[PDB]
Enzyme design. Structure first.
Site: not given
Ligand SMILES: [Cl-]
Ligand SMILES: [Cl-]
Length: 263
Positions: A42, A139
């Site tokens: 992330s 993602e």
């Protein structure tokens, strides 16, 4: 010395640790595995937000534009997008805020679609003089963190330099730089990582991330009481630690790096 201290942490935790402490102007103060490749996890959401802000700077995006999605767009970790889904959209601003401060994965994917996909973030890194960082997947599969795979990677030094440019340098407009800095200071996910290893008196903003195979990373900027400005990137693979110990490991690296901050 720093090399021996970090090597001792690696052996003790059977982990791989990559760290770079850089000054405001991107110069390496202390590093270990600073030029070895680690998964971004992330942490990519920081430069992604910067790219979106740069597009707003350039008149190519509007902060209030509605990014539409449905339930199928949701991800397993998407706490804000789950709340907004009945409305059918999040704004560009909401998606930036949510991707940074909550690490929301659907918000991040909304932004990735907005900028034209992973290759356009790689292009942005190149535009900043970052020759190494690259995004390849969206993602959640960008988190696989497989040995020998260069997809979705950075190095501690490249990420620290990129972040120093965005946070301390001239790249973003005054407005966008302030928005990015204040969002990162308000991050909700980093209280037990780099911040936990630095004095509470210092201004700190950061973006965390975790990956498969025990990946856990944090990149932070900080400003000391004396007004000295730094970026610290900490990338770890610690498959045999539990999650809380992985955060403590990051904090431990920050404590070691903190001794090389001059007053
Ligand atoms: Cl969630
Ligand atoms: Cl973790």
């Amino acid at each position: 010395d720093f090399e021996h201290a970090i090597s001792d942490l690696e052996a003790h935790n059977q982990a791989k640790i990559g760290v770079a402490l850089v000054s405001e102007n991107g110069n390496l103060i202390q590093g270990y595995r600073a030029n070895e490749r680690f998964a971004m996890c992330s942490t990519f959401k920081l430069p992604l937000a910067a790219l979106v802000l740069s597009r707003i700077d350039a008149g190519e995006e509007n902060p209030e534009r509605k990014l539409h999605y449905d339930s199928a767009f949701l991800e397993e970790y998407a706490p804000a997008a789950k709340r907004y889904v009945a409305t059918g959209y999040m704004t560009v601003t909401e998606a930036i805020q949510s991707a940074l401060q909550l690490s929301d994965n659907a918000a991040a994917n909304l932004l990735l679609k907005e900028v034209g996909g992973p290759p356009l973030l790689t292009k942005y890194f190149r535009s900043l003089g970052d020759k190494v960082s690259r995004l390849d997947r969206i993602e959640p599969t960008l988190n696989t963190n497989t040995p020998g795979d260069e997809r979705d990677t950075t190095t501690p030094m490249s990420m620290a330099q990129t972040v120093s440019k965005l946070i301390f340098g001239d790249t973003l407009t005054y407005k966008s730089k302030g928005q990015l800095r204040r969002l990162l200071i308000g991050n909700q996910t980093g209280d037990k990582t780099i911040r936990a290893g630095l004095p509470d008196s210092w201004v700190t903003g950061d973006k965390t991330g975790s990956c498969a195979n025990g990946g856990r990373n944090d990149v932070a900027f900080f400003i000391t009481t004396a007004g000295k400005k730094y970026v610290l990137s900490v990338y770890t693979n610690a498959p045999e630690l539990q999650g809380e110990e992985r955060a403590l490991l990051i904090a431990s690296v920050a404590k070691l790096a903190r001794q090389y901050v001059v007053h």
